[PDB]
Amino acid sequence: GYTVAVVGATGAVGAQMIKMLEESTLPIDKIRYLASARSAGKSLKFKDQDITIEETTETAFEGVDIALFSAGSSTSAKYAPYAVKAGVVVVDNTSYFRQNPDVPLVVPEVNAHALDAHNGIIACPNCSTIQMMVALEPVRQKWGLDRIIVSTYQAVSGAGMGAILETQRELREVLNDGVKPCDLHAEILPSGGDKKHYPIAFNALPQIDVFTDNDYTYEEMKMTKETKKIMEDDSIAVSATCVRIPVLSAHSESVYIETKEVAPIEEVKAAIAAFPGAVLEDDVAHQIYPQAINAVGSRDTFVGRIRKDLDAEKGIHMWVVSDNLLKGAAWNSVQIAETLHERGLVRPTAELKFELK
Amino acid sequence: GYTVAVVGATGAVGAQMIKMLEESTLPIDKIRYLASARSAGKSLKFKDQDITIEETTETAFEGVDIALFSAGSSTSAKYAPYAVKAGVVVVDNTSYFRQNPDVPLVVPEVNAHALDAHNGIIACPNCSTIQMMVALEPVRQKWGLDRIIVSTYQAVSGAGMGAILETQRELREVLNDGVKPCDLHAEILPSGGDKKHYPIAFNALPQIDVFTDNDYTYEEMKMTKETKKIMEDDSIAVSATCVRIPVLSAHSESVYIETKEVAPIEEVKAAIAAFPGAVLEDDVAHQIYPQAINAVGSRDTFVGRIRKDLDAEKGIHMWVVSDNLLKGAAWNSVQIAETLHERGLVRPTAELKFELKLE
Numbered sequence: 001g002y003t004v005a006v007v008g009a010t011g012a013v014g015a016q017m018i019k020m021l022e023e024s025t026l027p028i029d030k031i032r033y034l035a036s037a038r039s040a041g042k043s044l045k046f047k048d049q050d051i052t053i054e055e056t057t058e059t060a061f062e063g064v065d066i067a068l069f070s071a072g073s074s075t076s077a078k079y080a081p082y083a084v085k086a087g088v089v090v091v092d093n094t095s096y097f098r099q100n101p102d103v104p105l106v107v108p109e110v111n112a113h114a115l116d117a118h119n120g121i122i123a124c125p126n127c128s129t130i131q132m133m134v135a136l137e138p139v140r141q142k143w144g145l146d147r148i149i150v151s152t153y154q155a156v157s158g159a160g161m162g163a164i165l166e167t168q169r170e171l172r173e174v175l176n177d178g179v180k181p182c183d184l185h186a187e188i189l190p191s192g193g194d195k196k197h198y199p200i201a202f203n204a205l206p207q208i209d210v211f212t213d214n215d216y217t218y219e220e221m222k223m224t225k226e227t228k229k230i231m232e233d234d235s236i237a238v239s240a241t242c243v244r245i246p247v248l249s250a251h252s253e254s255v256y257i258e259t260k261e262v263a264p265i266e267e268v269k270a271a272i273a274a275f276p277g278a279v280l281e282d283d284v285a286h287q288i289y290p291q292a293i294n295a296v297g298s299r300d301t302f303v304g305r306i307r308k309d310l311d312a313e314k315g316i317h318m319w320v321v322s323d324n325l326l327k328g329a330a331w332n333s334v335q336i337a338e339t340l341h342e343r344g345l346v347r348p349t350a351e352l353k354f355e356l357k
Numbered sequence: 358g359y360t361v362a363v364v365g366a367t368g369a370v371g372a373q374m375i376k377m378l379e380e381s382t383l384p385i386d387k388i389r390y391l392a393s394a395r396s397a398g399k400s401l402k403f404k405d406q407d408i409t410i411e412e413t414t415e416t417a418f419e420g421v422d423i424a425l426f427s428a429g430s431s432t433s434a435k436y437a438p439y440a441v442k443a444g445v446v447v448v449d450n451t452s453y454f455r456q457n458p459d460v461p462l463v464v465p466e467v468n469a470h471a472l473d474a475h476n477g478i479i480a481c482p483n484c485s486t487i488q489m490m491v492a493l494e495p496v497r498q499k500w501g502l503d504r505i506i507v508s509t510y511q512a513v514s515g516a517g518m519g520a521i522l523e524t525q526r527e528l529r530e531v532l533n534d535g536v537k538p539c540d541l542h543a544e545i546l547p548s549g550g551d552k553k554h555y556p557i558a559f560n561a562l563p564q565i566d567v568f569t570d571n572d573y574t575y576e577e578m579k580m581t582k583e584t585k586k587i588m589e590d591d592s593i594a595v596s597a598t599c600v601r602i603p604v605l606s607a608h609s610e611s612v613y614i615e616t617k618e619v620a621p622i623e624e625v626k627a628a629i630a631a632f633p634g635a636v637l638e639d640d641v642a643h644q645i646y647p648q649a650i651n652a653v654g655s656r657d658t659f660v661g662r663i664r665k666d667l668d669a670e671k672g673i674h675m676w677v678v679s680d681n682l683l684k685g686a687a688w689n690s691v692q693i694a695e696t697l698h699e700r701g702l703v704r705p706t707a708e709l710k711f712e713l714k715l716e
């Protein structure tokens with residue numbers, strides 16, 4: 001069996017990493033929980049076992065077979081390369097290594113083949129991107145993809161435990177104390193690292209992550225660049241608008257595509273239904289469509305509102321929802337680890353391709 | 358001055374119609390508040406005056422110059438024609454008359470010209486459509502519009518007072534009592550008239566109004582059909598996805614357009630800023646963009662996140678926000694009434710062009 005380390009075990013994603021590992025088939029002989037110095041020494045459960053949280057350091061990965069990193073880009077940048085040096089296979093939830101050509105960027109249902117040539121780090125994509133890939137890959141396979149326009153409806157847990165608590169506090173101030181939403185004080189959303197913070201309570205914030213030089217945010221650009229890498233097609237046109245709404249868990253997306261060939265809607269629905277990881281929830285006669293509150297806790301990605309554009313021959317609209325902490329993060333990561341296991345890819349990497357920092 | 362009736366004075370739009378009329382320049386000599394049998398006999402303020410609410414009837418409109426209808430499509434269907442027969446000019450907030458070729462469908466900044474040939478009923482468009490037209494008309498004027506793709510983020514007050522109360526109740530049960538969102542009981546949303554109801558708390562519901570036979574909802578098709586009528590151009594391709602989110606007031610929209618000619622983004626920003634009713638809130642260096650919570654209470658429509666598409670030469674994305682009860686409803690209606698006054702258009706229509714529904 002394996003020694004598995006969870007780096008960032010105490011955070012929003014870390015908690016779901018724990019749950020997904022507890023529910024995994026992976027043969028785990030030893031579990032280790034790693035975090036920052038301030039969590040080191042506390043106890044956290046794995047099933048019935050009490051695990052003592054350890055501080056994350058350059059020398060903490062000896063004996064580890066698989067390390068699941070969800071502690072922030074800076075933590076991955078600093079320590080993942082030392083984990084690889086120590087013989088670990090790293091599955092990284094952060095954005096840091098995603099565009100490195102030596103790093104596979106994987107959604108197992110779409111591009112598991114990219115795992116075979118790994119150099120010790122496999123990157124989990126952005127949550128918003130992952131669910132969109134699960135919905136669209138079965139369409140791309142049969143009729144191609146020319147372009148995507150997506151507008152997202154993103155849950156606050158994507159921004160971490162602090163953002164969840166900020167959202168809850170803000171809502172209670174409005175509902176219980178009668179504070180006007182525009183008068184609330186915020187410290188985290190829309191982006192912890194950016195200069196100004198705004199209320200999310202009763203709001204829709206069109207900013208996720210920080211702005212890039214082209215006036216799209218880094219979240220929007222991740223959707224663009226990660227799609228192209230995952231689907232191995234730089235020709236796919238992708239533009240995104242990423243919006244935070246007052247939902248704690250599960251991202252929803254209004255997705256428009258144009259296919260390369262006309263894709264009859266009944267066949268599109270069937271192709272999505274048949275695709276592993278995708279569940280068709282589409283029966284408008286009974287008001288059946290994907291819903292954030294229904295997706296919470298499920299590893300599947302739910303797709304509905306599927307319909308032809310009113311004018312564009314090859315245009316199709318749909319609604320895609322998944323739990324952003326599960327398929328969008330912890331489940332995608334555990335599924336990668338399970339796929340590595342299946343393929344006999346859990347083993348030390350001989351060549352070090354990642355500079356030690 | 359005028360005798361003005363507000364039909365549906367007691368609901369979510371009605372409260373804002375009252376506020377907008379209190380703050381209006383319209384010379385009002387008399388106010389009457391009309392609603393259903395349920396509210397008849399109750400009292401409601403106009404400024405410092407107590408106004409007794411009346412049941413809406415066939416015979417309620419004698420002496421009325423202007424009637425603002427916001428009581429539901431059936432109520433407009435039943436009583437607006439009798440108002441017109443009585444000599445009233447009706448401003449109707451409902452969908453009922455919007456696609457009637459005898460009825461102007463007006464956003465005053467865009468197509469006030471359509472008011473001149475009115476036949477006693479002027480229709481206010483759907484709230485989601487109105488704010489989109491305010492944002493896009495200045496772009497259309499300079500560079501044309503070939504298509505629109507819109508995904509909306511709609512506040513619950515668009516579904517009425519009941520939906521507001523339902524949303525607050527649900528949120529309190531979750532936040533204060535620890536109820537799981539999927540265990541919530543809903544009675545109204547997504548659509549009061551439809552068969553099944555779902556929680557909105559911590560949810561996003563991709564259904565506004567009921568489904569039509571092409572699998573778009575009526576809300577989505579309204580954005581399509583109303584845009585084409587308001588802009589007087591059937592060739593504009595419009596497809597919409599309309600979604601309810603946990604916001605009480607102000608609708609937000611992610612709007613994609615393709616223009617006919619390449620529209621430089623800095624010029625687009627300037628054209629929108631310069632257009633009456635539109636305010637540019639677009640300074641990403643200081644994280645300035647429209648926000649529902651800032652839009653509440655303002656008659657203006659706020660536009661930002663303006664940027665070219667990453668691939669389509671003539672593609673532009675933006676973010677549009679307005680208070681759905683103000684520019685989306687009560688303010689657009691009062692602004693129509695003020696525009697009718699400016700143009701000498703508040704007077705009886707001699708020829709009745711609308712079916713009377715009460716034999």
Ligand SMILES: NC(=O)c1ccc[n+]([C@@H]2O[C@H](COP(=O)([O-])OP(=O)(O)OC[C@H]3O[C@@H](n4cnc5c(N)ncnc54)[C@H](OP(=O)(O)O)[C@@H]3O)[C@@H](O)[C@H]2O)c1
Nearest residue numbers: 008009010011012035036039056070071075160161162163
């Ligand atoms: N805000 C604080 O002052 C504070 C205090 C204690 C803990 N934290 C951690 O950070 C989060 C605070 O809210 P959040 O929204 O930021 O959490 P979050 O994004 O949901 O989770 C961040 C996770 O990354 C870990 N992490 C952060 N820096 C690290 C480092 N240098 N080395 C190894 N692991 C690291 C955290 O462990 P740690 O828990 O050890 O940080 C935590 O498990 C907590 O979940 C908690 O995990 C923060």
Ligand SMILES: NC(=O)c1ccc[n+]([C@@H]2O[C@H](COP(=O)([O-])OP(=O)(O)OC[C@H]3O[C@@H](n4cnc5c(N)ncnc54)[C@H](OP(=O)(O)O)[C@@H]3O)[C@@H](O)[C@H]2O)c1
Nearest residue numbers: 365367368369370392393396413428429451483484517518
């Ligand atoms: N332009 C837009 O986008 C827009 C936006 C929102 C609403 N609207 C229109 O306005 C309507 C009402 O919206 P709301 O949000 O104010 O709804 P609401 O909060 O539910 O209020 C409904 C109003 O309609 C009145 N009413 C109901 N049945 C009636 C009847 N048989 N006769 C006379 N009055 C009656 C109610 O009176 P009681 O209190 O006596 O029941 C109340 O004043 C909607 O159905 C829609 O057509 C348009």
Ligand SMILES: O=C(O)CCCc1cccc(C(=O)O)c1C(=O)O
Nearest residue numbers: 073093094095096126154158159208
């Ligand atoms: O808004 C959301 O739904 C969450 C986005 C996830 C996220 C949050 C902070 C930092 C990073 C990052 O590693 O850059 C990432 C990421 O791209 O995975």
Ligand SMILES: O=C(O)CCCc1cccc(C(=O)O)c1C(=O)O
Nearest residue numbers: 430450451452453483484511515516
């Ligand atoms: O819910 C929203 O945010 C927008 C829908 C407003 C609305 C609600 C019920 C009935 C009608 C209607 O008159 O059909 C209308 C309308 O189109 O004005």
Ligand code: NA
Nearest residue numbers: 630631632635
């Ligand atoms: Na302006």
Ligand code: NA
Nearest residue numbers: 698699700701
């Ligand atoms: Na005049």
